[PDB]
Design a protein around this ligand. Sequence first.
Ligand SMILES: Nc1ncnc2c1ncn2[C@@H]1O[C@H](COP(=O)(O)OP(=O)(O)OP(=O)(O)O)[C@@H](O)[C@H]1O
Ligand SMILES: Nc1ncnc2c1ncn2[C@@H]1O[C@H](COP(=O)(O)OP(=O)(O)OP(=O)(O)O)[C@@H](O)[C@H]1O
Ligand SMILES: Nc1ncnc2c1ncn2[C@@H]1O[C@H](COP(=O)(O)OP(=O)(O)OP(=O)(O)O)[C@@H](O)[C@H]1O
Ligand SMILES: Nc1ncnc2c1ncn2[C@@H]1O[C@H](COP(=O)(O)OP(=O)(O)OP(=O)(O)O)[C@@H](O)[C@H]1O
Ligand SMILES: Nc1ncnc2c1ncn2[C@@H]1O[C@H](COP(=O)(O)OP(=O)(O)OP(=O)(O)O)[C@@H](O)[C@H]1O
Ligand SMILES: Nc1ncnc2c1ncn2[C@@H]1O[C@H](COP(=O)(O)OP(=O)(O)OP(=O)(O)O)[C@@H](O)[C@H]1O
Ligand SMILES: Nc1ncnc2c1ncn2[C@@H]1O[C@H](COP(=O)(O)OP(=O)(O)OP(=O)(O)O)[C@@H](O)[C@H]1O
Ligand SMILES: [Mg+2]
Ligand SMILES: [Mg+2]
Ligand SMILES: [Mg+2]
Ligand SMILES: [Mg+2]
Ligand SMILES: [Mg+2]
Ligand SMILES: [Mg+2]
Ligand SMILES: [Mg+2]
Lengths: 247, 247, 247, 247, 247, 247, 247
Amino acid sequence: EYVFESPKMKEILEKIKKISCAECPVLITGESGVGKEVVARLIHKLSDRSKEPFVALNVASIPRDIFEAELFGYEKGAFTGAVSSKEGFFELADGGTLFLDAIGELSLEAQAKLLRVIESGKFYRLGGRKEIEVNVRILAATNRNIKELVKEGKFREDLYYRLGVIEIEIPPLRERKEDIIPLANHFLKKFSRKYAKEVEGFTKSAQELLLSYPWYGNVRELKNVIERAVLFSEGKFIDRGELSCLV
Amino acid sequence: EYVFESPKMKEILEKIKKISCAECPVLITGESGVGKEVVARLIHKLSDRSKEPFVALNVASIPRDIFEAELFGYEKGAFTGAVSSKEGFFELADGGTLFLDAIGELSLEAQAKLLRVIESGKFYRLGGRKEIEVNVRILAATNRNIKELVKEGKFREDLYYRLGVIEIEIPPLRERKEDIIPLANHFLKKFSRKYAKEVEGFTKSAQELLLSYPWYGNVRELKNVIERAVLFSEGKFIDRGELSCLV
Amino acid sequence: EYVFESPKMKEILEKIKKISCAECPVLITGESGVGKEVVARLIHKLSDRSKEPFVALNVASIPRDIFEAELFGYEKGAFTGAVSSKEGFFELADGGTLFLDAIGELSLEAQAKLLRVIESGKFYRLGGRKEIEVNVRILAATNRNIKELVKEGKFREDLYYRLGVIEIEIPPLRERKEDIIPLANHFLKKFSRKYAKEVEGFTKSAQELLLSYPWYGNVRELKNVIERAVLFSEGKFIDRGELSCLV
Amino acid sequence: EYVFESPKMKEILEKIKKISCAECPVLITGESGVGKEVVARLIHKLSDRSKEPFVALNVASIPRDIFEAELFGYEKGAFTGAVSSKEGFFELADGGTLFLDAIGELSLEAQAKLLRVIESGKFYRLGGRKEIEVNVRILAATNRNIKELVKEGKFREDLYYRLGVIEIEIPPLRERKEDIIPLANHFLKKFSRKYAKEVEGFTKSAQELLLSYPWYGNVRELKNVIERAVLFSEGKFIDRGELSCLV
Amino acid sequence: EYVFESPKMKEILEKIKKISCAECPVLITGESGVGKEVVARLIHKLSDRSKEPFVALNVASIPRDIFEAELFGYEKGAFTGAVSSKEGFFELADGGTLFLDAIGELSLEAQAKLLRVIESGKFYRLGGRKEIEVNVRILAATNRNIKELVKEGKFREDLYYRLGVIEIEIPPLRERKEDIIPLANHFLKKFSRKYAKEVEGFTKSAQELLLSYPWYGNVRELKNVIERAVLFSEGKFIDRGELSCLV
Amino acid sequence: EYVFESPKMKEILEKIKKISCAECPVLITGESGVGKEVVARLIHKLSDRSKEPFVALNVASIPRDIFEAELFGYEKGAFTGAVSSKEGFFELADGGTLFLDAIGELSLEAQAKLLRVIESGKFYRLGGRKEIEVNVRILAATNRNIKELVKEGKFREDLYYRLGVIEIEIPPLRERKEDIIPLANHFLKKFSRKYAKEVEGFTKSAQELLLSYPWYGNVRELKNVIERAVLFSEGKFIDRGELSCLV
Amino acid sequence: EYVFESPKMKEILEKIKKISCAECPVLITGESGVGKEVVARLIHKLSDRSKEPFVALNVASIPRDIFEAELFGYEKGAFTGAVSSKEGFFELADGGTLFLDAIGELSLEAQAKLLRVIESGKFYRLGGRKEIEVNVRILAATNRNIKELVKEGKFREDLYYRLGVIEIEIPPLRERKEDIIPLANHFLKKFSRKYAKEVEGFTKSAQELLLSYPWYGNVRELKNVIERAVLFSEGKFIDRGELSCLV
Ligand SMILES: Nc1ncnc2c1ncn2[C@@H]1O[C@H](COP(=O)(O)OP(=O)(O)OP(=O)(O)O)[C@@H](O)[C@H]1O
Ligand SMILES: Nc1ncnc2c1ncn2[C@@H]1O[C@H](COP(=O)(O)OP(=O)(O)OP(=O)(O)O)[C@@H](O)[C@H]1O
Ligand SMILES: Nc1ncnc2c1ncn2[C@@H]1O[C@H](COP(=O)(O)OP(=O)(O)OP(=O)(O)O)[C@@H](O)[C@H]1O
Ligand SMILES: Nc1ncnc2c1ncn2[C@@H]1O[C@H](COP(=O)(O)OP(=O)(O)OP(=O)(O)O)[C@@H](O)[C@H]1O
Ligand SMILES: Nc1ncnc2c1ncn2[C@@H]1O[C@H](COP(=O)(O)OP(=O)(O)OP(=O)(O)O)[C@@H](O)[C@H]1O
Ligand SMILES: Nc1ncnc2c1ncn2[C@@H]1O[C@H](COP(=O)(O)OP(=O)(O)OP(=O)(O)O)[C@@H](O)[C@H]1O
Ligand SMILES: Nc1ncnc2c1ncn2[C@@H]1O[C@H](COP(=O)(O)OP(=O)(O)OP(=O)(O)O)[C@@H](O)[C@H]1O
Ligand SMILES: [Mg+2]
Ligand SMILES: [Mg+2]
Ligand SMILES: [Mg+2]
Ligand SMILES: [Mg+2]
Ligand SMILES: [Mg+2]
Ligand SMILES: [Mg+2]
Ligand SMILES: [Mg+2]
C-alpha cells in the first residue's frame, strides 16, 4: 500500500530489494515528509530480520548526560543511582534492527561515542569492565544536509563513512511529479473509506493544482491536504476551489 | 452559550463540526483572548471522545530537566532513584484528548522529544526498555506567530506538519466586528443575572464605542469591560460615558 | 480608620464597595506607599470571603527552583522531595483570598506557570497526576509600571488580561492633595495618643509645607514624618521649623 | 562612657533619648568608624527592650542560598536533609531587637525577601504553611551611601521607606572637631589605666595635630592611634613627634 | 587477507614485522579509513602478546569527570558512590595491549593525567594510597594532524615523545594508487562470495575510474563502493557506468 | 637566634617588646621573605599568651564554600556530613593567638564574614542559634600592598581599621643593608655546623657582593644562597666567585 | 648506567653528590626529555633517605576539588567525608621523599594551598582540627619556564623561594654535544643486547648527523631514534642513511 511511481522512487524501491540479503548500514536522507521512515521500515520488512525487533530511537533528543547509559546500559555499581545492571538500546536490538533517527542532529560529543560500535558491534557498559558484543543492523535517517555537515565539521567524517555504506537520498515531492497524483488518489481512497464519504476523485483543474504546488512538507503535507479535502468535501469530486482554500 | 456570528467564526464552527468524525491533530492559533481554548474544548465535546478525559497542559512551562519524565513517565530503577514507575501525561490521556497549550513557546530541545510520539503514539519511559503505545488525540494552541517561527527556525518544520493536519486560525476581535455586539450582549446578560443588577442593554452611543475599540485583549478584554460596566452600572442601560472611562 | 478624601480616592472606595458581591481578580497598581496593601485588605474585608483566610505572598521573591512546589505543592514520591505530599499556597487559600504581591517583578518563566490556574482554578502538584481544583479569589499588586512591562514584553499579555479584570490604579500622594492634611491629622492623633504627647495640630505654615512636599514615599513617607514630628515635638502644635528639618 | 560633645552628636544623643518610648525602625548611616554600632546599642539600652536580646547580624554576608532559612527558619520536611524545624533569626529576636548590619550591601534578591516582614512581622518558614508572627524592633546600619543606592536602583525604594522611619546620619570625625580632643582624652585615660602607664595628656602641639588630621577611619582610627601612643609613650605627656610618626 | 602492495605499505608492513620483538609505544596516524586500526591489530597479532588481551578504547570520548576512574580505577572509600574497589582499563590490560584510539582528540587536561603512566607503568587509583604497577604495551592512533597539534600547543610535547617511539604514518589511498585495484579486487571477491553473486572483475574503463577518484574516505570508502557495486551488479563484470553512479 | 641590626629592625623589635602587655590586633606587611612570620611568632612568644596555642592559617586558601564552617564551625543539624557539632578555628584558638596569614588575598566575600568577629569575639556557628564568644588575639600578615588594596576597593576599609591597630611594615632586605652581613654570618655558622664543614667566613670581595645584590626573595633568598655556598664550599672562606655563580 | 660527560652535566652530578648530606628542597627545570626525573631519582638514591619511599605525583593533574583531600587527607566526619579518616600523600611520604612533578603547571589556587607545608611540615586534614606534622623531603620538576612564570605572576614568588633552595637547570641536549655520542653509544649497547642484534656502533657519517640534529625531544628523542635504528638495522654498523630516514 505504498506508492512508488516516479523514476527515482522506482530506483529506490529496487535498491531496497537488492539489499535484502545484506545487513550493512543504510543512511537515508531527504526533506521532511519525503518518506525516510517508510523506507527504513520497508528495508526492515524485506530484510533477513523482518521478524526481529525494529527499535526506533530519536538519537539526538537523548540528553547528553545519559547518552551512554541509554545506548550501552550501565553496570550495577559505582557509576550509579542503582542496584542492578540495565541493558541499553544496542542490546535491546541485538539480532534485530536499530534505527537511529535524526542522526544528523547528534552532537559531536555523542557522534564520537557511537563511532566504535557501528563497525565492531562491541562496547563497554557505563561502569563495566566486560566487553559486550551485539549483532545489530543499523539504519539511520535525517532531514539535515549531512554532506554539508561533514564539510563544515559539524558531523564526523569517520562516522559518515561508517553509516553511509548504502546511501538512499529521497527527493522532494516537487521533483517526483509522477508520484503526486497516484499519492493523492491513494489518500483519497483511504480517507473516503475511513470517514464514510462519497468522494471518488479530483477534477482536472484540481489535479493541475496538486502538480504545481511545491509541497514543502512533501508527502505528509499532501496527505494532510487530502485528509482535509475529504472531510470538508460535498460532491463525488474535489474541485480546484476546495483545494485552493486548503493550500 | 458560545457566540459565533461573524463569517469567519461561522466557518470555524463548521470546520469543527465537520471534523467530529476525525481524530487528527488540530493546530489552533491566534492572539490572546480570541478563543483558542474555547475552540479546543468545543472540538473535544463534539468529537468521538467527548466522554474521555481532556488533559490540558502548558507544555512550554514544564522545566527542561523533567520534560520526558512528565510526558512519558519513568521506570522504577536507576535513572533517578524513585522506587516505582510513574505514568506520564501521554498515558494519562490514553483513549482521550491531550491539549498541548503554548506549543509555540516550546524549546527546540523539547519539540524534538515530542516528534516521534505525535504520529506513532509510541515512546519509551525515561529509563525503560519497553515501547509503550497510546492512542491519544492531539490538540495544540499558541498565541505565537507559528508560521514565522518555522521560517526563523525557532520551531521545527517536521513538528509543524505533524501538528497542523487541521489548522484553525482564529482572527482578532477587531476583524470580527459582527461578533462584538452579540458578545457584549451575551456578557451583559450573564453578569446582570450573576450580580443581580437591572442592566438590560447598551445605548447606541455605547455600541459605537464597542465596535471601534481595537480589543487588544480580544474576547477576554471585552468580557472584562462588560463585567466592569455591569458592576458599576446604575441605569437599565450602559451609556458611552460608563464605557469610555473603562477603556 | 482609613482616610479617603480626594476625588480619586473616593471613586476607588466606591469601586471597592461595588465589587463586594464579586470574586473577580483585582489588579492594584501605584507607587510605593500609596496604599496598595490597604486597598487589597479592604477589598477582602468587604467581600464575601471576609471571614476566610487572606494569604499574602511576595510572589517574585520565591526562588525559581521551588516556585511550583510552593504554589502547587508536591506529591510524595516525586523527586527527592520527601516522604509525604505537601499543600501549596493555592490550596492553603482554597475558599479564601490569595494576594500576589510584587506581581510585576515576577519572572517570565514564573508568569507562565501561573497562567492556567488564574482562570481554571486547576493544576497538578509537582510530580502528581491528579488534577486539583481550588476556588481562590485572586488579588495582585505591584509598584512597577505594568502596562509598560506588557508593551516591552517583560510581562505576558495573556496573564495581564487574566489578572486585570478589575483595575485599581492608586495615584501618588502628590496628585491627591486633598488627602494630605486629613492624613497628617489622622497620624498626629494616632501617634500623640500612642506616645502620650500633647500635640494637637499643625500651624498654617506647617500645613503649607505638607501640601507642597512631593512625598516620593507617599503615604508611608508622610506617616514617618508625622511619627518623627510627634516624637520630637514640644508644643501643642507642630510648626514649619519642626517639619522642615524632617524632610 | 561614650563621648558626645559636638553639636551634631549632641542632637543625635537627644533623638536617641526622644525615641526611647518608640519601637519604630531606625536607619543608621555614616563612614566606617563613626559610631554606628555604638548608636545602635545605645538605642537598645535606652529603649523599652533594654532587657530583651540584641541580635546582631551582618545581613549581607549570609550566602544567598540560605538567606530564608537563616532569617525565617525552615519546617521539618522541607526538601529532605532535615528532621526537625529550626527557628530563624527573626524568631530568635522575638520580643527583642534585631540589628541588620551592612544593610546597604544586601543583594536586590535578598532585600525583596525582607520586604513584607519589616512592617507586618509575619512570614512563612522555608517549606512551611503556617504564617508566623513576631514582634521585633528593627535597627539597621550601613557605611554605604544609601540614598545614592536608591537613586541608582541598587537598593529598593520600598524597603528604604520601611527601614528609615527614624534616620540617624552620623557625620565623619573631621566634621565633628569638637569631639576629637575629648575622644583622644577619653582613650588616653582608658589605655593609660589598662596598660599601667604614666601618660596624662597631650602637648598643645599634639592636640593641633589631632584636630587637623582627616581621620579616614574616624573614631576607630583615633582610638587606634591613641592606643599606639600610650603603648610606645615615655613621658607623662604625648608630644607632636610621638603622634606624627603614628599617622 | 590484508592488502599491502604499494611501496609505502610494503615498508609499513616491514616495520611491523621488525618490531615484533619489541614492546615500545607505537603512534599510528593518517586520514579516516587508511587502515590505522588494521595496523594496530596487526602489530598486536605479530607481537609477543598476540595471545594476551587487546583492549580498545576511544580515549577522547570518556567524559572528563570519570577519566581517572575509568583508566586507573578507584578504591573503595571516599571519592565514592561505592562499596568496593574497581580496576581501571590499565589494569584490565596488564600483560596485554592497550589501544588508545583518537589520542589526538584528547583534552589537555586528560593528556596530563596519562603522562606518568606511559613510561613508568605506575599510578594511584582514584582515592587510593598504594602505587599500582602494570606492564602494558601501548598503541595509539589518530586521524588528526598530531605534529600540528603539538606546534599549536593543543597536544603536549612531552606526551608526544612518550607515545611516538615508533611512528607509522599511513598515507591516503590517493597516494597509494598501487593499492587501489588489488583492494578493489579483494573486496569484489569477498562480497561476490558473501552475497552469492557472479561478479568476477572490473572492465578496464571501471579500473581507470577507481584509480582517478580521490577516495576521501580512503580504504573504507573504497570497500563501501565495491560492496554497492556487487549488490547492484548484473553482469560478470562491473563497468564504468555502474561505478560512476556510485561515486 | 634572630638577627635585628639595622635601625628599622631595631625599632620593630622595640615595638614588639612594648606591646607584650597588650592583646590588640597586629597587621604585619612586607615583601616575601622579609620575616613576617618570624615577627608574628616573636610577638606571640613575648606576649601574655606565650604558653597558649598559636594557630596558623592561610586564610585566603580556604575554599569559599567552607569558609564559615572552617572559621566558625557548624552545629549538628545543618545537614551534610553531619551528625555532630564541630569547632571552627576561632574556638580552637580560644585563649590563644590566631594568625591569619595571606590576609590581603582574602576575597571580599570572605573579608565581610570576618568583620564582626574581630572586635566582638562573637559569632554564630554555621546553622546554629547560640552566639558563641571567644577571646582570641589576632595577628595578620600579607605580602600584598594592603593600603593600595584598600584604595582600590579590593580590601574593605572597615576590616583594615580593625586589623591594623598596631602596624608593622617590615622593609625589604635591600633597604636594611646593616642586616645583610650579620644575617649571612648567622647562616654560615648555622649551616657550617649542620653540614660539618670548615667554612668560617666570607672574603671582603664576597661581602661586597652580598651588600649590592637586591635580594628579591629577601631573607629567605639570602638564607638559600648561604646554604648553597656552604654545601658547595671548599675553603675556610667563601670568595666572590663561589657566590657570583650562585646569584 | 647514567651518562654525564659534558661539562654542565658533570657539574650537575657534582652538586647532586654535594647535597647528599642535606634535605633541602630541590627545584629541577629543563626542556622535555633532558633528564629531570633521572636527576630527581638520583638525588634520592644518593641521599640519607635512599631507603625510604619515593612518592611521585603529577601535582598539576590532580583535580582542584580534591587537591586538599589528596595532599593532606581528610578526617572522618567532615562533609560526608566517608566513614573514616584517610592519609594524604604528605603523610604517605613521611620520612621519605615527595616528588612534585609538573610543579610549574600548578594553578595559583593550588600553589597557595602548598605554601605553608613546604617549610613548616605542618597542615590540617580536610575537616580536621589537629595539626599534623611530617618530615618530608621535597623535590620538584617542571619543563615550564618557571622564572618567567614568576615574573608574569603565573607562579607565586613566595612558593618559588621555598622550593628553589637548590636549583638544578638541566640544559637541552643541543647545548651538551659532548653527551650525544656517549648517550647514543649507551643506547645502542642496551638495545642491541635487548633485541639480540649485531649492531656495534655508528659510522663517522652517522655520528655527524647525531651531533647536528637539534633533539627537540632531547635525551628521550635520542633514545627513541637509537631504539628504531637498532630494530631496523642490518649491518654491524648504523650508517647516515639509516638515521636520516629516522629523523
Ligand atoms: N511512498 C509513500 N506511499 C504512501 N505513503 C507515504 C509514502 N511516503 C510517505 N508516506 C506517508 O507520508 C508521511 C511521511 O512519511 P515519513 O514519516 O516516512 O516521512 P519522513 O521523510 O521520515 O519525514 P520527517 O523528516 O518529517 O520525519 C507518513 O504518513 C507516510 O506514511
Ligand atoms: N465565541 C465565544 N463566545 C463566548 N465567549 C468566548 C468566546 N470565545 C472566547 N470566549 C471567552 O473569552 C475568554 C478567553 O477565551 P480563551 O481562554 O478560549 O482564549 P485564548 O485564545 O485561549 O486566549 P489566551 O491565548 O490568552 O489563553 C474566556 O472567558 C472565554 O470563555
Ligand atoms: N488611605 C490611607 N489612610 C491611612 N493610612 C494609610 C492609607 N494608605 C496607606 N496608609 C498607610 O501607609 C502605609 C503604606 O500603605 P501600604 O503598605 O498599603 O502601601 P503600598 O502601596 O502597599 O506600598 P509599597 O509599594 O511600598 O509596598 C501603611 O502604614 C498604611 O497603613
Ligand atoms: N561617641 C563615641 N564615644 C566613645 N567611643 C566611640 C564613640 N563612637 C565610636 N566609638 C568607638 O570607636 C569605634 C567605632 O566603632 P563602631 O563600630 O561603633 O563604628 P561603626 O560606624 O559601626 O564602624 P564600621 O562601619 O567600621 O562598622 C568603636 O571602638 C567604638 O567603641
Ligand atoms: N590494507 C588493507 N587491506 C584490507 N582492508 C583494509 C586495509 N586497510 C583498511 N582496510 C579496511 O577498510 C577499513 C579501514 O578501517 P580502519 O579502521 O583500519 O581505518 P582507520 O584509519 O582506523 O579509520 P578511522 O580513522 O575512520 O577509524 C576497514 O574496513 C578495514 O577492514
Ligand atoms: N630577623 C631574622 N633573623 C634570622 N632569620 C630570619 C629573620 N627573618 C627571617 N628569617 C628567616 O628567613 C626565612 C623567611 O622568613 P619568614 O618565613 O618569616 O618570611 P615571610 O615575610 O613570612 O615570607 P613570605 O611572605 O614568603 O611568607 C625564614 O627561614 C626565617 O627563619
Ligand atoms: N643522563 C642520562 N643517561 C641515560 N639516559 C637518560 C639520561 N637522561 C635521561 N635519560 C633517559 O631519557 C628519557 C627521559 O628522561 P626523563 O624522563 O628524566 O626526562 P624529563 O626531563 O623528566 O622529561 P619530561 O619533561 O618529558 O618529563 C628517560 O628514558 C631517561 O631514562
Ligand atoms: Mg522520520
Ligand atoms: Mg489558552
Ligand atoms: Mg505593599
Ligand atoms: Mg558596625
Ligand atoms: Mg579506527
Ligand atoms: Mg609567612
Ligand atoms: Mg618527568
